[PDB]
Amino acid sequence: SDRKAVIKNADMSEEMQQDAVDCATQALEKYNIEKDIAAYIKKEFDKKYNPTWHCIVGRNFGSYVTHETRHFIYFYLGQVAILLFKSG
Amino acid sequence: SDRKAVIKNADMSEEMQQDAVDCATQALEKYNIEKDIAAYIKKEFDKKYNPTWHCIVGRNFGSYVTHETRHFIYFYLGQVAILLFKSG
């Protein structure tokens, strides 16, 4: 990978943040379409860190969400922005 | 307003869908930044339809989310796409 990871806003353990970056790297190598990248990441996080996660992947969006404490990350990987958080 | 509403995917009562469009119309008239539009819509839906809602507003994004039955809408209003759903 030559993609630069830049974590913009996180409320999350360091190991979980690293796992989000690693998971997104695998998603981007397999899939080109944003919704497919998002589904890969969401499903992995549901498995490793319990339901219920939600994932948005894109180049132009804003958001207002509610998340469980310690289960939120917003980061860039290359030119793609990724929002990943747990609620409900 | 001259913005065209196109509901792409909804699991939601007709009246709630109309309220999402009306709320987003008010948000777009007041605010220019996607995150501020999203916050306006999320807060109105938490008030009218109970917590906990999440809102994404943008022109380029894909998503994979989990939502409570009958509480999901994805729609365009003008050139902006809006994802609004309840979870947790």
Binding site: N9, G58, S63, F85 | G58
Partner: peptide, 14 residues
């Protein structure tokens, strides 16, 4: 609440 909080994100032009 200590169990949850709201968060905002906004992509930036680069």
């Amino acid at each position: 609440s200590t169990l949850y909080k709201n968060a905002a994100t906004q992509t930036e032009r680069r």
